[PDB]
Amino acid sequence: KPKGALAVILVLTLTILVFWLGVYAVFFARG
Amino acid sequence: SRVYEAYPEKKATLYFLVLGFLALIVGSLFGPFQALNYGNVDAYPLLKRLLPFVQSYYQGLTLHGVLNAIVFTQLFAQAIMVYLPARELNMRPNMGLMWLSWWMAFIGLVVAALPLLANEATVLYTFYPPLKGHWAFYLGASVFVLSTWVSIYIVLDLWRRWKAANPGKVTPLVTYMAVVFWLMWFLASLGLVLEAVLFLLPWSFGLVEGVDPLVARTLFWWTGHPIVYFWLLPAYAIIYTILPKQAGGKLVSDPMARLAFLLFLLLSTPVGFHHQFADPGIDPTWKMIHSVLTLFVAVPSLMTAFTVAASLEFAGRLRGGRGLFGWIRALPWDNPAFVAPVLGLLGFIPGGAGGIVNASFTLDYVVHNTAWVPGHFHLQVASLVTLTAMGSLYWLLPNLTGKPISDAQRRLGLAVVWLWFLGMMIMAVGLHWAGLLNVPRRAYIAQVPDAYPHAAVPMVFNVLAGIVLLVALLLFIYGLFSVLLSRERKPELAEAPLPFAEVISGPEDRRLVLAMDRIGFWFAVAAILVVLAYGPTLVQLFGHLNPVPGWRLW
Amino acid sequence: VDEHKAHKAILAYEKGWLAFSLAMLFVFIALIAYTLATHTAGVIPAGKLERVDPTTVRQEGPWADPAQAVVQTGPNQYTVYVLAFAFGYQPNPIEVPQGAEIVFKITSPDVIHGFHVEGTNINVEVLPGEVSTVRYTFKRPGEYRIICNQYCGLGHQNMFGTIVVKE
Numbered sequence: 001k002p003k004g005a006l007a008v009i010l011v012l013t014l015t016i017l018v019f020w021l022g023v024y025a026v027f028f029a030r031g
Numbered sequence: 032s033r034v035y036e037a038y039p040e041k042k043a044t045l046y047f048l049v050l051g052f053l054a055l056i057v058g059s060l061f062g063p064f065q066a067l068n069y070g071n072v073d074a075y076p077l078l079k080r081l082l083p084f085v086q087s088y089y090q091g092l093t094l095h096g097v098l099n100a101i102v103f104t105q106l107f108a109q110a111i112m113v114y115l116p117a118r119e120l121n122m123r124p125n126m127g128l129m130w131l132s133w134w135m136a137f138i139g140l141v142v143a144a145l146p147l148l149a150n151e152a153t154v155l156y157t158f159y160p161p162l163k164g165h166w167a168f169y170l171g172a173s174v175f176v177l178s179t180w181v182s183i184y185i186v187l188d189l190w191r192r193w194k195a196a197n198p199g200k201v202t203p204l205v206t207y208m209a210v211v212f213w214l215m216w217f218l219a220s221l222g223l224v225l226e227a228v229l230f231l232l233p234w235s236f237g238l239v240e241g242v243d244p245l246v247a248r249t250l251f252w253w254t255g256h257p258i259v260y261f262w263l264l265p266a267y268a269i270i271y272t273i274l275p276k277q278a279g280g281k282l283v284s285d286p287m288a289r290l291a292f293l294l295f296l297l298l299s300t301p302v303g304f305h306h307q308f309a310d311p312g313i314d315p316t317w318k319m320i321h322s323v324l325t326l327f328v329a330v331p332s333l334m335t336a337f338t339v340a341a342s343l344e345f346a347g348r349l350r351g352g353r354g355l356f357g358w359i360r361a362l363p364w365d366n367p368a369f370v371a372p373v374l375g376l377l378g379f380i381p382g383g384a385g386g387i388v389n390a391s392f393t394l395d396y397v398v399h400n401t402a403w404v405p406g407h408f409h410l411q412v413a414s415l416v417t418l419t420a421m422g423s424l425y426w427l428l429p430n431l432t433g434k435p436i437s438d439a440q441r442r443l444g445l446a447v448v449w450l451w452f453l454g455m456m457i458m459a460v461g462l463h464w465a466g467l468l469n470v471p472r473r474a475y476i477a478q479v480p481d482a483y484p485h486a487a488v489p490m491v492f493n494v495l496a497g498i499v500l501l502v503a504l505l506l507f508i509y510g511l512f513s514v515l516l517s518r519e520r521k522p523e524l525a526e527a528p529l530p531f532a533e534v535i536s537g538p539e540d541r542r543l544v545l546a547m548d549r550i551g552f553w554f555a556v557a558a559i560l561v562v563l564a565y566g567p568t569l570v571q572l573f574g575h576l577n578p579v580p581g582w583r584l585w
Numbered sequence: 586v587d588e589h590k591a592h593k594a595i596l597a598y599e600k601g602w603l604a605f606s607l608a609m610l611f612v613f614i615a616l617i618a619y620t621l622a623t624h625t626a627g628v629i630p631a632g633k634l635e636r637v638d639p640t641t642v643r644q645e646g647p648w649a650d651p652a653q654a655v656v657q658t659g660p661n662q663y664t665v666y667v668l669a670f671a672f673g674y675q676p677n678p679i680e681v682p683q684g685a686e687i688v689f690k691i692t693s694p695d696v697i698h699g700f701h702v703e704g705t706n707i708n709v710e711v712l713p714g715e716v717s718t719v720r721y722t723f724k725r726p727g728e729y730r731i732i733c734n735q736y737c738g739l740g741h742q743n744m745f746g747t748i749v750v751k752e
């Protein structure tokens with residue numbers, strides 16, 4: 001089972017989420 | 032040698048690559064000065080002494096964007112996506128068309144360059160009307176880009192000849208990638224060609240009095256999104272079909288590689304309103320539709336992340352790496368051809384994350400036209416695409432020249448690639464963070480030193496990046512000229528095969544590949560999506576043209 | 586074979602990853618659709634083509650007298666006619682009441698400018714010959730800086746304006 005590949009797509013997923021939810025919050029704070 | 036008589040495509044490929052790298056060097060000279068500017072340090076009085084033709088920050092920025100993002104990227108795409116499919120099929124491209132394409136690119140570049148250098152086209156690489164450049168700029172740019180239509184013909188020719196000599200067989204993987212790449216580029220290129228031919232050329236010659244800036248921008252961004260996938264896909268071709276062998280492994284899936292490239296054919300062009308979320312006169316409904324389609328263009332790269340990581344893990348295991356992270360240590364970190372694209376892929380994670388924010392319609396109002404955007408795109412083109420190009424010098428240059436890489440040149444290459452990656456990562460922090468503090472892009476901010484006090488900490492990151500990348504560029508220049516001007520030659524390096532990776536196959540794979548090999552059908556679907564995505568808005572805009580006079584404000 | 590088992594195990598996980606990927610993007614589309622149904626969506630430019638002649642906008646019409654640029658158009662609504670030009674904004678300052686809906690109608694007599702109000706989601710391109718219409722309600726009184734964030738020529742980095750929001 002490709003544990004290593006899964007670790008990479010876990011790090012990608014968290015990066016996308018921190019970026020997207022961070023700016024979603026900023027959008028409401030400035031709205 | 033007798034090598035260029037048997038394989039004349041090697042000499043033409045080299046001419047593309049070297050013209051590309053020379054453009055990268057001259058464009059990149061301005062980078063560190065721009066980073067020092069985003070650090071509140073004005074080094075332009077020093078630059079003007081070195082290069083007295085430089086009149087302004089904005090003229091340097093025009094040269095930076097045009098030479099790095101338009102010239103170097105196109106010449107690299109023309110070199111890789113003609114030469115690799117030629118070598119996979121072991122067939123000679125039409126060498127008349129191949130030399131013609133090079134001469135077009137060379138003449139267009141010289142003609143565009145003259146007004147840029149003389150301060151007659153300080154309009155930046157987007158050249159948004161009604162800022163009115165010299166006619167030679169638009170003519171040169173037009174001839175430069177049209178070079179690629181000859182490149183499309185050359186590869187459709189190679190593919191046609193191959194299928195004729197091999198009826199019933201599926202397209203080989205690299206040739207498949209290049210065919211869908213060049214057909215996507217044909218559709219993509221029409222926005223800018225229509226903008227140049229209908230508006231910019233007649234306007235700059237004095238034949239029409241004005242241009243409609245909203246129609247001009249709409250046509251520009253038809254080409255302006257898919258041009259960044261045009262930059263990206265030659266690096267993806269190398270990462271899929273060559274990197275796995277260099278890592279000591281195999282491509283884990285041919286069909287998953289083909290699917291990603293097919294999705295780019297379908298989804299790369301019909302999305303350009305993600306550059307126009309802040310434009311008046313375009314229906315929000317169409318913005319929401321382009322937004323949704325933009326999130327779908329991310330899927331092939333989400334897929335690429337898994338297929339490539341799985342391929343590198345496989346290579347790590349084969350080489351005795353054990354555990355969650357031992358496969359990483361087992362990879363050839365001593366080989367600059369391996370390291371460069373892998374560091375590029377690491378920076379592409381935050382790079383892609385910023386792209387998905389940018390795509391999400393209302394979230395774009397937070398970051399639009401701030402330092403965020405240059406932060407995002409330096410991770411994509413200035414790091415992954417550029418590092419993958421720099422890595423190619425270690426396997427591709429010997430294959431074209433018979434010039435070997437000494438162990439010392441290898442060691443220098445590792446230093447260059449690490450410093451380049453680290454500099455881009457440091458600059459990304461400074462620009463993303465300055466962007467969220469509302470610092471604008473495209474601004475000589477060092478000339479208003481009191482305007483952005485809240486950004487003092489991110490500005491330290493920009494100075495540091497400025498210095499690191501100045502050192503990386505100087506080492507890159509020393510190293511490139513070392514390889515080119517070295518007198519030692521070994522001809523049978525030039526006769527060796529390219530390091531194409533093997534593929535793991537499955538029972539599944541043949542059914543999926545035949546479905547994907549219906550390229551006439553898939554191209555038709557891609558063309559209809561462009562018509563549906565753009566047609567209604569362009570009918571509305573062309574019905575209500577409001578041309579306005581041109582201005583020179585430099 | 587070892588390799589045959591890897592192809593199978595890799596594709597198995599890859600199919601879950603793709604399902605999770607699509608699910609995530611669909612959730613992002615739902616969260617964007619939400620923002621379009623709230624007051625925060627007023628910062629999206631009107632999709633209407635409102636054509637003007639950039640050569641007469643300083644001579645005739647609602648942009649010709651900046652001192653009469655703020656107009657009550659509703660019971661808690663003001664319309665502001667803003668000119669973005671090389672290299673400034675008129676009126677300067679823009680004076681509006683806290684808590685009212687402000688309809689900004691922005692045009693340029695020359696080249697493309699940006700209209701970015703520091704501390705808000707107001708971030709709109711201003712094209713000559715076209716009117717950019719956006720809506721916003723200021724919650725806090727004070728001074729908000731307007732930044733030109735589109736390259737408009739050599740004066741770009743000094744092109745600033747002021748909005749004053751009165752209690």
Ligand code: HAS
Nearest residue numbers: 259305329332336340376383386387389390399408411412
């Ligand atoms: C090559 C160049 C570029 C690529 C690729 C690119 C990708 C995206 N971009 Fe972008 N971009 C935008 C959205 C996207 C989206 C949704 C993607 C997607 O295609 C991105 C998907 C990518 C991913 C989801 C990342 C996948 C991660 C991978 C593949 C890494 C895996 C790592 C591995 C395998 C390593 C493992 C190894 C070990 C050793 C562990 C938007 C809006 O939607 C704007 C306008 C914003 C504004 O307001 O102006 C924009 C603006 C730009 C501009 C500026 C234009 C200008 O001058 O005004 C440029 C030049 C640019 C370039 C590029 N951009 N972009």
Ligand code: HEM
Nearest residue numbers: 062063065066096099100155156405412413472473474500
């Ligand atoms: C030493 C390397 C580099 C450094 C330090 C650097 C730095 C910068 C900075 C700070 C900006 C933003 C300036 C502004 O908005 O006013 C910029 C703009 C840009 N850079 Fe780079 N850069 C480098 C290399 C590259 C490369 C390799 C590419 C593409 C292959 C590239 C493409 C761009 C583009 C397209 C722009 C935007 C131009 C525009 O807004 O009109 N850069 N660069």
Ligand SMILES: CCCCCCCC/C=C\CCCCCCCC(=O)OC[C@H](O)CO
Nearest residue numbers: 024028029031612613615616619620623625
């Ligand atoms: C396997 C489990 C299956 C279950 C799947 C569930 C996933 C749903 C995700 C997101 C919900 C969207 C929430 C929409 C509500 C938005 C509220 C909001 O953001 O409000 C903040 C702001 O203050 C307002 O003005």
Ligand code: CUA
Nearest residue numbers: 698733735737
């Ligand atoms: Cu107005 Cu920049």
Ligand SMILES: [Cu+2]
Nearest residue numbers: 255256305306
């Ligand atoms: Cu785009």
